[PDB]
Amino acid sequence: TFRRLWPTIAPFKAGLIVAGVALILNAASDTFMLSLLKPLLDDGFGKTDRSVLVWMPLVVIGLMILRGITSYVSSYCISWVSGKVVMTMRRRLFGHMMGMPVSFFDKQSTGTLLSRITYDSEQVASSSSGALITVVREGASIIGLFIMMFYYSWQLSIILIVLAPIVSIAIRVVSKRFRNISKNMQNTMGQVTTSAEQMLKGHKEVLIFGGQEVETKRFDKVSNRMRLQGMKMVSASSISDPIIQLIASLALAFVLYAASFPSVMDSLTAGTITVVFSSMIALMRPLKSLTNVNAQFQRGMAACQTLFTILDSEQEKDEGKRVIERATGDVEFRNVTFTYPGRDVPALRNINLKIPAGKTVALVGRSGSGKSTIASLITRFYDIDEGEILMDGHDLREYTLASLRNQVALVSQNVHLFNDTVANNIAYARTEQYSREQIEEAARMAYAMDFINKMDNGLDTVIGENGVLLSGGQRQRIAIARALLRDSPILILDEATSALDTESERAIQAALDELQKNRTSLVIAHRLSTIEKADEIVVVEDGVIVERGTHNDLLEHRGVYAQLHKMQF
Amino acid sequence: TFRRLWPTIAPFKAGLIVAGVALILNAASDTFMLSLLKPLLDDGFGKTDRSVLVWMPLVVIGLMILRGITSYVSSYCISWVSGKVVMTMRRRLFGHMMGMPVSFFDKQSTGTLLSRITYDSEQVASSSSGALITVVREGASIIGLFIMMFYYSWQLSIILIVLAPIVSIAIRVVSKRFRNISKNMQNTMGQVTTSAEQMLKGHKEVLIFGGQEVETKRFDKVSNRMRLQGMKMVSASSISDPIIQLIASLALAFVLYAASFPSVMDSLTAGTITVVFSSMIALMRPLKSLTNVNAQFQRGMAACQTLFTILDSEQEKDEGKRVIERATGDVEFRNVTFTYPGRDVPALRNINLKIPAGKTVALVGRSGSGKSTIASLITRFYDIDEGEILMDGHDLREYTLASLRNQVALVSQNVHLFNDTVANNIAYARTEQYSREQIEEAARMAYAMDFINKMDNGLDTVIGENGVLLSGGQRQRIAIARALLRDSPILILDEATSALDTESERAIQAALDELQKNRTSLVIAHRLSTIEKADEIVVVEDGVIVERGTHNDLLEHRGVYAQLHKMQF
What we know:
Two copies of one chain form a homodimer.
Chain A: H1 13-35, H2 37-43, H3 52-99, H4 110-152, H5 156-201, H6 203-209, H7 212-257, H8 271-311, E1 331-337, E2 354-355, E3 360-362, H9 371-379, E4 386-391, E5 394-395, H10 401-407, E6 408-411, H11 422-426, H12 436-445, H13 449-454, H14 464-468, H15 472-486, E7 490-493, H16 505-516, E8 521-523, H17 528-533, E9 536-540, E10 545-549, H18 551-556, H19 561-568
Parallel strand pairs in A: 3-8, 3-9, 6-7, 7-8
Antiparallel strand pairs in A: 1-2, 1-4, 4-5, 9-10
């Protein structure tokens, strides 16, 4: 289409302008080179003993140096422009992405999203740059070649432009007719191939009926028909080439017949003919390329449109306007039915689960569904499909998103550690608020001080990718230390690390005890020790509150907790 | 370089010869055509007279007509050998394919077999033809242009052909160095892309901690480094072009200096330089084609090796010495444990089932495992992995295969209706053995006479694919007529349809009665009526002899016949 984007290009108008001149001169750096033929072939050889011939190599060297300089400067400046445009574009896109809700990150577009960030964006920038250079350099080449043509031949140029389009249309029509014939006969080829296919698949019958000889005979006939069809097809193509070659040669012969001696022509001869011919042969390239530019510009902006489909999709709406420094009130699900976006089946029915302050609630459903989403619900990553989760007398959707997300600290077994220094990761975007000594104290009370200790730079080492590549349990420890630093009232534990880590599983247990010593302690506790530690275990088989109460009572009445308990054994 | 084809390409050598001769001119045409340039640009346009100018178009037209006719004739004739080799290889493949055991049709090759027959054999022939047409045309052009050059310039030919290869090596070395730089820098840029991928992948933890600001900042940094890497990459890729262009232009400048500085040169005049330059400009292509010639040769001839592997493999083993007209004595597989080739699990376990003369036995199974292959065992489609199949006290493995195939007739809902006429299908490959009248008599006694009756040409109607396209039940009716005309003693019937076609199922039951009125009948049966009809229903669930006896007796002993009757209802 006609896009927009003129802002986000406006400041770098200077760099583009350089190409606008540089590329233009590039055309001259070729056109004059072509023009250099006329001084040579007319007056720079055996006709003259020695003259223009001795200096011409210097002229060619200088012209090619000019071409190289123009190419380099044009490439650098068109780069600069494209790089700046893509710079601003990627920064805006990623800024909107980070605010974009998890609904967009429904795992449907995870792979495509990095593509949009880098590959598709670079593709659009490069396509637009290619379009600009192909409409500037090649466009100016056309104009220069025509100007030189007229400056050299007064009448012959009109002959060439009168004859070239007629020749092109004749070649196109003959090629179209012969390609249509070729495909029409390719259909017969396919029919005979199907005959052979039906020949083969009957082997089961052929062998049992002992008719291999008649099969051989009819295959002889069918193969002969195949050979005849291939004959005719190859003949069609082999006559297609000579006809176009002949029409081109007839065009050239007509041109050379215009070299007759009326007053119209033949006063410009010798090298002039050579330069016009070479100019036309070279013009063959710009003319062919320019018509292709339409298929390029769209090929770029279409992607932009596609990219725009990703830029302004459903966005995160912080409709809530209530801010709380701390959430001392108990967490209470109330008649909350959750529908997972992109999934018709409701992952949760209405539930009135209440999480008292400073109490441990364990959601330990073995169903493997709904339980994970329950952890997200308190954080409002998704949206409450139905019902209300009330917080100190106020619904979650009523609260400001930033404050609520602050109220909750998330720790799991797949904590995606950020590529930064270890100290910063302890308080991301808040390390300015927290003192370094506070980070060290949190790490020590996090029962994970050793990992920083034996690390060479301690609280100054880059830790993420291209860092140290610590184990999953180490990520658990760093995340729990981060939580201790944040001291958020709301706590969610995945506990997914059901495996027993060597020398750290006990450390992890002690650290989780420190984490849950106070503050709300909703946990997804698969481990039996965490289950018994929980004050009010509320296990859900992804539908409803199937069982609830203390673990011993849950064992008393079988329900579903009995099977889960015996599975844990 | 195997060239086992040469015995199979000798009978057409003559045509190939006229391909080469006609191809040599297809090169010489250009050599003379470019030579025509010298008259044009030396004693042509410039001079007042048109002596060589008016005929110029006539010579071009005549010479290009010669070029076109040579191209057409040479390509058509090389395609003649190509076709008559591709077709003979195809025919040989098919001939040794019909004799191949069903093992080759293990479904290891179902559609790749058709690909071999047409696509791969074509590739063989077309690649060999291209090798010839590009090591004759192209080499002929090479030698022609070289001799033309050396004729026109005593020394310039050397001073140019000695620059061509040094220039080529310089271009290649600089290109390789810049490509290595480009790939290394692209690796760095990809590393930065992985950093950005980590950046975006952490959206969950980015949002929960309310730190999108620091995320945006570090994204600014990483993306700025991205843009620097992209700028450097584009700079390197672009500056690659000027260096090669400049080295080429420097070589050309040296070439021109070769005429300029010395006095031994400078007799070249004007046209001769254009002749030589165009000679090399064209020759740049034939050298590339010749370099690729051997690549194409060994790209295509390996297809011939594969084709020979298809050809040169064990034809269906015919290690049988016993011929019998009719096997009235009971065929029985005793202590036979069959293994489906390519399937480790035996589908048959040492079953000692005897098929009594005249009396009908039935094999019945839900999954069909083993049961389906029980019938196949009788025809020796597969081979005797264990045990012996003794018909009239004589082993099938001992019997000549053709006689055994005659002994047993296969009838099923799915039958390959040969792509021929109705009568020939009724007696495939033995229509000579069975006279025409008995064909329609057997159709009438088959109770499926109507279809032959109402057919367009009746008994002579083409019935194959790309033809009438009867239904599956109709094909089964044609098969029943097939077997009835054959009157074979052994009858294996799939009964896979187990469905009532309108007006055709009762007819099929009657035809089954007629076929099984006498003759041994091993029937894979699902119909309850067929089950009760069989004297001994030895139903096997792939275990072995799972259960046997009359349907009433099978009911008495529930075994598997209880669930079998459940399925029947």
